[PDB]
Structure 1
Amino acid sequence: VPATRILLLVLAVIIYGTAGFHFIEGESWTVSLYWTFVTIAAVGYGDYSPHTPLGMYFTCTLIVLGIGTFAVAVERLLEFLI
């Protein structure tokens, strides 16, 4: 898969996660973006996490759609940086 397509795919995941956390959990856009990276990179500090049923459901979807997408994106980035 072309590196640029992978880039678009991860950006789409980042938008999905950021907007979802912002509207569902009520955190700021900045905190939501940060939480999205922390989540799809599977770093998960837990400083932020969903506290509502809908948030938990949403997070599971982001986990399933974002973790794999992020993994592929980073490796491809490694090539263009190495």
Structure 2
Amino acid sequence: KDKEFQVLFVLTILTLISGTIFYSTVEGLRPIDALYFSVVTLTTVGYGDFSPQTDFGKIFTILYIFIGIGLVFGFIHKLAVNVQLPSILSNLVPR
């Protein structure tokens, strides 16, 4: 399960890495604001402090959202159940 977590963890990193590269290049964001925007996008928070202004950016966001949501929320799912929960359970039993 650490290896089930690891695979999704890597895949999410590669997914955010890619959004960072596209949005910094085509939409002109700083690398930090691209990563931020990528995370705010794929988690469906969506503040809209940053949004794509080019048509190439709008098109890529359509595909990025559809490809990216399933992954991101699977990692989060993994993270909650296989990492956060046991840690919580361990804090209720002094060793």
Map residues 7-22 of structure 1 onto 2, 5 A cutoff: 7-22=9-24
Counterpart code for 2:28 = G
> In structure 2, how many angstroms separate the alpha carbons of the residues matched to 1:24 and 1:65?
19
Please list every run of 5 or more consecutive structure 2 residues that lacks an aligned counterpart in the other structure.
86-95
Aligned residues: 82
Verify the 8 A CA contact 1:18 1:29 in the aligned structure 2.
Answer: yes
> In structure 2, how many angstroms separate the alpha carbons of the residues matched to 1:21 and 1:67?
17
Given candidates 48, 51, 54, the residue that maps to 1:49 is: 51
> In structure 1, how many angstroms separate the alpha carbons of the residues matched to 2:15 and 2:69?
9
Larger radius of gyration: 2
> In structure 2, how many angstroms separate the alpha carbons of the residues matched to 1:10 and 1:22?
18
Describe the SS at the equivalent of 2:67.
Answer: helix
> In structure 2, how many angstroms separate the alpha carbons of the residues matched to 1:41 and 1:32?
14
Counterpart code for 2:84 = L
Match of 1:31 in 2: 33
Please list every run of 5 or more consecutive structure 1 residues that lacks an aligned counterpart in the other structure.
none
Identity percentage of aligned residues? 32
Q: Which runs of 4+ in 1 moved over 3 A?
A: none
> In structure 2, how many angstroms separate the alpha carbons of the residues matched to 1:12 and 1:61?
16
TM-score normalised by structure 1 residue count? 0.95
> In structure 1, how many angstroms separate the alpha carbons of the residues matched to 2:15 and 2:8?
11
